[PDB]
Amino acid sequence: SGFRKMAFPSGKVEGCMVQVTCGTTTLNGLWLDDVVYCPRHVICTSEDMLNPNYEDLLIRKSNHNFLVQAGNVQLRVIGHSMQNCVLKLKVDTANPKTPKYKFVRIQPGQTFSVLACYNGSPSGVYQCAMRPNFTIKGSFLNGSCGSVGFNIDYDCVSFCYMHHMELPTGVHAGTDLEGNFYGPFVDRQTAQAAGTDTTITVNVLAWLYAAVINGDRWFLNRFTTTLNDFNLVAMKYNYEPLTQDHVDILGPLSAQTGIAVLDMCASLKELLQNGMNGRTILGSALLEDEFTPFDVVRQCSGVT
Amino acid sequence: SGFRKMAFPSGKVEGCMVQVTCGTTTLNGLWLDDVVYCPRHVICTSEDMLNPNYEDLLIRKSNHNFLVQAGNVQLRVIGHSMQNCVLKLKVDTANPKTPKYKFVRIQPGQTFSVLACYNGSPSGVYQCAMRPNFTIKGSFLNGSCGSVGFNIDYDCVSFCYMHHMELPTGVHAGTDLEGNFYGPFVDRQTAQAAGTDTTITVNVLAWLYAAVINGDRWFLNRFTTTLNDFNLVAMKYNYEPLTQDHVDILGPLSAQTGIAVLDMCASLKELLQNGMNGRTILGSALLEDEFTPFDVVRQCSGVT
Numbered sequence A, B: 001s002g003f004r005k006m007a008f009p010s011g012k013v014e015g016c017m018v019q020v021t022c023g024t025t026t027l028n029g030l031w032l033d034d035v036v037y038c039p040r041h042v043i044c045t046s047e048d049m050l051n052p053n054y055e056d057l058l059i060r061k062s063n064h065n066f067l068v069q070a071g072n073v074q075l076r077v078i079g080h081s082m083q084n085c086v087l088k089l090k091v092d093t094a095n096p097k098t099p100k101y102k103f104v105r106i107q108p109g110q111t112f113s114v115l116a117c118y119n120g121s122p123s124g125v126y127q128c129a130m131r132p133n134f135t136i137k138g139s140f141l142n143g144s145c146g147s148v149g150f151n152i153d154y155d156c157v158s159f160c161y162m163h164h165m166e167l168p169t170g171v172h173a174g175t176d177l178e179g180n181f182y183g184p185f186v187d188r189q190t191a192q193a194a195g196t197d198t199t200i201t202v203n204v205l206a207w208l209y210a211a212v213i214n215g216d217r218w219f220l221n222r223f224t225t226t227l228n229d230f231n232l233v234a235m236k237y238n239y240e241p242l243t244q245d246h247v248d249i250l251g252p253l254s255a256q257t258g259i260a261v262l263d264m265c266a267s268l269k270e271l272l273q274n275g276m277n278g279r280t281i282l283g284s285a286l287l288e289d290e291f292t293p294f295d296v297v298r299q300c301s302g303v304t
């Protein structure tokens, strides 16, 4: 029993982290096979960052200007290319610790683990969600760029995020591993405001199911609702609309607990309208939205 | 910027996890050098667990009754002993992935990372604290016994916890790696109630400092207090007494923020008396007590 904000074991990703230095900028790279992936802004001076022309800046860079260090051993860079907002540094050595992997572009509301790194060395691991406004709420100091977000399916690491930017509001923006930003963000030090950070409704519902499975049941009420009625209340509270697709995804948790999804919606509706009245659910005083239905099943079943 | 409940990177510990089977019970072992450490209750039938005599039960067990599997390879058990509530299985092979390590017995209020494992395979990593009542609030299904808690200092893993028991209230009890339970708990399926789960005051204060460092400042007020005045309020709210030793430990966060520890106590005092009034601090609606002052410094500075 018990339910924790749980990250994937980070070992398979730790084995992929390297240090990338271009001039006086050091950040993190991801070494898979004979390619090191890193933010293209590794090439920028802080002056460059205000209005960088990455193609023009890259012309001044040779393979030997990219210093790649794996532990205390230097890797030889034999090629470099820009793909969207990432650099791909071809090295002469395949990472011997390369796990089975995929690059995936996640949807808002999807959760993943971040391995926060500085100088190619892992400092910590935590669980994130892609926010509906395509930011993440991370923990990233200077030097943490190139840190990655991932999911694991048994032995296959799906890489979904690479850290690029902190917005003036202290929320985070980055790319998939093809170098495409999540959301409208750019690797330029300019006015970039996030949109509404709405609550991931399907995730809250999943977590309420987790609560029931772990004995926290005080919020279960006598009511039901419809998707349309619930959605009127959701909209008023800056919750994402719930779709039949979300209802379908929650079916297994419905089945396990015997609580109809729309009944749990009606419980969530009363929590929104009434508040927590100083009570907690799984040790939280707010409704947690960084567990997916898949996460809740995984943790309640014990997948490895 | 940003502040997350962050675990240590788990790779060094993943390399130590094995499966231990005695009869029809499978749980986790920790393989360091040529010793596999596991809960002694691996030898019990569920009938045994009601009133186990571990010395008597152990007489019926030989080295060959302990099946130890590291990945899909069997380890040869050449000796076994009981130390308090752990078994030490001597194997003929040193773990080639043994990291630098120590066994440490932590104090209440100290935080650590748990690598939740099933069948010797890692499922997830999360951050815990030793509660003042010597329980932890974990995420542990059947099969998770022998999962470990640890801290890392650069490259030395300090092992502080091994999972043994879930109490009827769904909180967790376990041992250090010398097999001594935290608190008054025993590896017997009997009436074991936890004491008062008080809030770790020095940890809340550390986290309020983290909040100020990351721009969450709304709770800072015009007041100060004394340790004695604060402690009157703490006692009323089931917070641990704050000692001068705690004040000394918070000095570096005091220095960095320029907020006197007793001023931050007076802010915490007003939050206890007034509540959050529906506001959040670092995305929490309750005062977080599972960050130590050391954790806050580490994460705000970026140690690897």
Ligand SMILES: *CC(=O)N[C@@H](C)c1cccc2ccccc12
Pocket (backbone or CB within 6 Å): A025, A026, A027, A044, A045, A046, A047, A049, A141, A142, A143, A144, A145, A146, A164
């Ligand atoms: C996130 C990161 O590690 N890289 C960027 C933000 C960075 C770090 C340190 C100095 C510097 C100077 C000029 C531009 C960018 C950076």
Ligand SMILES: *CC(=O)N[C@@H](C)c1cccc2ccccc12
Pocket (backbone or CB within 6 Å): B025, B026, B027, B044, B045, B046, B047, B049, B141, B142, B143, B144, B145, B146, B164
């Ligand atoms: C925690 C754990 O993995 N071991 C214990 C609780 C256990 C698991 C599964 C079956 C069983 C049967 C009898 C006693 C103990 C167990």
